[PDB]
Amino acid sequence: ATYLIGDVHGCYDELIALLHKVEFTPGKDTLWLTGDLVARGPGSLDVLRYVKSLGDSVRLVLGNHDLHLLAVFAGISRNKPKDRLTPLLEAPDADELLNWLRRQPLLQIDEEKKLVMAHAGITPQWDLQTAKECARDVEAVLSSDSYPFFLDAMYGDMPNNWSPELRGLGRLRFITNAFTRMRFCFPNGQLDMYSKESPEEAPAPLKPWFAIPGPVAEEYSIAFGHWASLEGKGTPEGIYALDTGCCWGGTLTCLRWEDKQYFVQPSNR
Ligand SMILES: [Mn+2]
Ligand SMILES: [Mn+2]
Known part of the structure; x- marks a missing residue:
């Protein structure tokens, strides 16, 4: 069977309880995870240990809190007490777990199921070929020795409109925001990077990315x-x-x- 679970955020106990409910069995079953494996909940360390141990039985995409964790680890960004990441950052296997984490995809596709997964969704400004190329480009920087430079360059809210002519830092920042931070779009599909409310509480003319x-x-x-x-x-x-x-x-x-x-x-x- 194929199981899909949403943001775990360090909720190790709930994750294991849910997988026991459905009798998740590696080798018979595959698990898809929407990312944000870490932060806020108490057990980011155990979550990463377990998900990494699943190997080919799990299909993960990286979320924005996963990337922030990598930014903290790399000395790029400051640790926020409320994220509860210290046990993971201080763990003796931190290097192994985080070097595995940064090699994971931003995008998962299963053609037989006609199913796509990404943390925040797929912006309507992208066709599948473009989404694939953009994921590959950012995965390449994240998996490279020079990943701290990328992580530093990722922060920013602009540009918020896709074009195949985008180059350089702006291109990476858009790709990152689209895969991991997107919620609302303007009518032309441009990303809004400020509203985190429910669609009914959002200000016009903003609509959910999936409404376009x-x-x-x-x-x-x-x-x-x-x-x-x-x-x-x-x-x-x-x-x-x-x-x-x-x-x-x-x-x-x-x-x-x-x-x-x-x-x-x-x-x-
Ligand atoms: Mn989340
Ligand atoms: Mn998120």
Whole structure:
């Protein structure tokens, strides 16, 4: 069976309880994770140890808190007490876990399932070929020896409009924001980097990225996490918002692909 779970955010106990509920069995089953494996919850260290141990039985995409963790590790960004990352950063296997983390994809595609996964979704300004090229470009910088330079360059809210003519720092920053921070779009598909509210509470003319017809979403199902205030609700057919805010006292959600059956684990917070 194929299981898809939203943002774990260090909620190790809930993750294991949910996987036990569905009898997740490596070798028989595959797990997809929407990223943001770490921060806020208490068990980022155990989460990374477990997910890394799953090997080919897990298909992960990186989220914005995963990238921030890598930025802290690399000395680029300051550790925020509320993220609760110190046990992981101080762990003796921190290097092994974080060097594995930075080699993971931004984008997962399964053609037989016609299924796409990224942390925040697929901007309607991208077709599938472009999304693939952009993921490959940022994965290449993240997996390279020079990744701290990229991580430093990633921060920024501009440019917020895609063009194949984008070059250099602006190009990387857009790609990063689109894959890992996107929620709302302007009518022309340009990213808004400020509103984190639910679609009903957002100011006009902002609409959810998935409310704008895009070429990927017209052909593929898209699973994503990230947007907790969406509460997994309000999406079109073929769009699966899996982040139901476990670290926030919400729930951890697991979707079984074959029958589209949902399983839920209540937060322990
Ligand atoms: Mn996120
Ligand atoms: Mn998140």
